Design a binder for this molecule. Structure first.
Ligand SMILES: CC(=O)Nc1cc(Nc2ccccn2)c2cccc(O)c2n1
Length: 124
């Protein structure tokens, strides 16, 4: 079945709220959330509902925009680079599990190119 989702709070992890992390929630995430290809990434992969029983045998660092959202809302991150790593992990997983030109990869590559032009400039 499905593994536990990644943690969205951790009381012994130091937390911070920088200007660039506010921008990742308020601006970067909340617009990517609205893209037409955003739905498969708005929650952890449900390997049971999707009949992908091999997903979590291949992917061992799962990540998804729904986890990132709760992490941003809970001030989980020390800095913006930690949150950007989570985004890249989400995109990289999708390219590892699937193959060039799959419908899901096209969705991810569309989000990823949008993600890059949106983080091109972060606040100060
Ligand atoms: C062969 C295959 O179904 N691959 C998939 C399917 C996903 N979500 C879905 C969900 C519903 C229908 C089809 N697809 C998916 C999601 C996130 C990351 C991934 O790597 C994914 N890979």
């Amino acid at each position: 079945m499905n593994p536990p989702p990644p943690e969205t709070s951790n009381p012994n992890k130091p937390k911070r709220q920088t200007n660039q992390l506010q921008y990742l929630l308020r601006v970067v995430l909340k617009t990517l959330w609205k893209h037409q290809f955003a739905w498969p990434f708005q929650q952890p992969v449900d390997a049971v509902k999707l009949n992908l029983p091999d997903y979590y045998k291949i992917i061992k660092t799962p990540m998804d925009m729904g986890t990132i959202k709760k992490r941003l809302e809970n001030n989980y991150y020390w800095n913006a680079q930690e949150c950007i790593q989570d985004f890249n992990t989400m995109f990289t997983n999708c390219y590892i599990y699937n193959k060039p030109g799959d419908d899901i990869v096209l969705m991810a590559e569309a989000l990823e190119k949008l993600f890059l032009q949106k983080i091109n400039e972060l606040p100060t």
